[PDB]
Design a binder for these strands. Structure first.
Lengths: 290, 290
DNA sequence: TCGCGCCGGCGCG
DNA sequence: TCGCGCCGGCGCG
């Protein structure tokens, strides 16, 4: 029952004071180093949170703020999803798919996945958009999850499953994006997913912005390569129940598709998934892919 | 120095426990009942926050959570802006403008401001968007601030300035939206503003969604009334410094304007204002209006 | 009851 | 240092 030797929380100094820092990956390793998480997702998140709370208590330290936990829970959910997605393509034996948890736009802009030709197409768009009196851009956060269909990206090292959470295992899932840098043909990118532990009426609209901007960059590519068949879909996924009001908001259109009376309107977010269990991650990936 | 008789915090029961509730309007009245706020905005917000914090301390009660303050600060800033905007149109003598702090989409959907003819134009769009296999919508939060140019809406009661914050004064500013219900011609709506005490890379993109959706509803109206001259602009306003990265994000395009090579692209958010002082609110309104 | 729309406090490079 | 992108906890009808 000894919790005082845990490293899921770290001490550091700032302005002559000792401060507390949650180490979200350490919490995952210290709970899941023999087996990867199973059952209800939300409960595992609360379990991890109550674990760090017990640790700080046992060490006699100040409880981390709600913001620290907001941040921390976001990472847990993403890593749970990234690991489950890694194992999905192994057990399904998807020789030509990758599901990749992306870092932030500054560490690695998702545009860097694309081959030289496609990056130049996007550079032409970006540069022309700035060639006006009123300069415009197309900025969004990196998608949390990207689904890429390209057979020659898959190496045999990806075909070893993750049965336990180590520093080494979490590292490989979270640096997967590095292997595909400058290698994806434009239509290899088939889907992205936004991952949220919970939704708010304000925060759910960030999923619409994301889908809208991504589908707008993709529609440019479809015209630059005059391909009417290639599709890019954008999805949402919550760990909580999704309400009617959440559902309506996320039916919102990618606005460039609704200008004309005889256009068929596209949703910016094609579907929203309520991931109750780890089995639901597999279910979600089944729908997105097949 | 007696803080124990203050009503800026309220006690209420929930599951056999006594809970604390900030009363954000009471905090404003108890600080500004002789004169309306002046000087630096951010400092007045911190002043109001430190006032309720001193009150709970003096009463020996639990300090409200950061979420309670997040909520509370949002209301203070909006009311400060609403009151300053009320006084702006008086001192400028804008006989044909109203600046209105809107409630939420459920209390009063901003679409209800419009006259019967324009509401039917939007109902045709909404209903047709649902008349597909994949149903789509155009959902956003209500704009925080709306600027309406229509001379016949202005009554003489609006021309009395607000020199002190009472329950009665805050009520009139915050129910102003009720007077214009079903009265605005479509092109009377000239601007909306999103008001934020601070920005985040995620949260600032909600201003882009808002602008994008609003300009998409307005572009429909421009076509339904075949008017190439009518404009609707969308603006942001922070109480903190705005960074280069905030600036870039909010240069993002209303995506329906960038489809074609010879389109002139429009920003979804036309400008972002950093409101340091109350004088800056006046400055901002000067640019938006004239 | 919950729906709305608010925003602060992160861990990490 | 700050930029990224995370999300919980509201007051109110």
């Amino acid at each position: 029952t000894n919790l005082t030797n845990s490293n899921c929380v770290e001490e550091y100094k700032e302005n002559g004071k000792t401060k507390i820092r949650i180490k979200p990956f350490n919490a995952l390793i210290e709970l899941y180093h023999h087996q990867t998480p199973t059952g209800s997702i939300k409960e595992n998140l609360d379990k991890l949170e109550n674990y760090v709370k017990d640790v700080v208590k046992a060490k006699g330290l100040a409880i981390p703020t709600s913001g620290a936990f907001s941040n921390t829970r976001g990472t847990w959910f993403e890593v749970m999803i990234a690991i489950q997605s890694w194992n999905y393509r192994v057990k399904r034996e998807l020789n030509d798919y990758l599901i990749i948890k992306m870092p932030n736009v500054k560490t690695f802009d998702f545009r860097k996945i694309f081959d030289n030709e496609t990056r130049e197409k996007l550079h032409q768009l970006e540069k022309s958009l700035l060639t006006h009196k009123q300069q415009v851009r197309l900025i969004t956060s990196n998608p949390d999850l990207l689904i890429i269909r390209q057979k020659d990206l898959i190496k045999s090292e990806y075909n070893l499953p993750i049965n336990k959470l180590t520093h080494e295992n979490i590292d490989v899932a979270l640096t997967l994006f590095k292997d595909i840098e400058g290698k994806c043909k434009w239509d290899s990118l088939v889907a992205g997913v936004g991952l949220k532990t919970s939704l708010r009426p304000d925060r759910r609209l960030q999923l619409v912005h994301e889908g809208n901007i991504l589908k707008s960059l993709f529609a440019h590519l479809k015209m630059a390569y005059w391909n009417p068949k290639a599709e890019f879909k954008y999805y949402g996924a919550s760990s909580e129940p999704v309400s009617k009001a959440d559902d309506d908001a996320l039916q919102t259109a990618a606005t460039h598709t609704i200008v004309n009376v005889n256009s068929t309107p596209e949703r910016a977010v094609d579907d929203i998934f309520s991931l109750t269990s780890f089995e639901d991650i597999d279910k979600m990936l089944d729908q997105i892919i097949k």
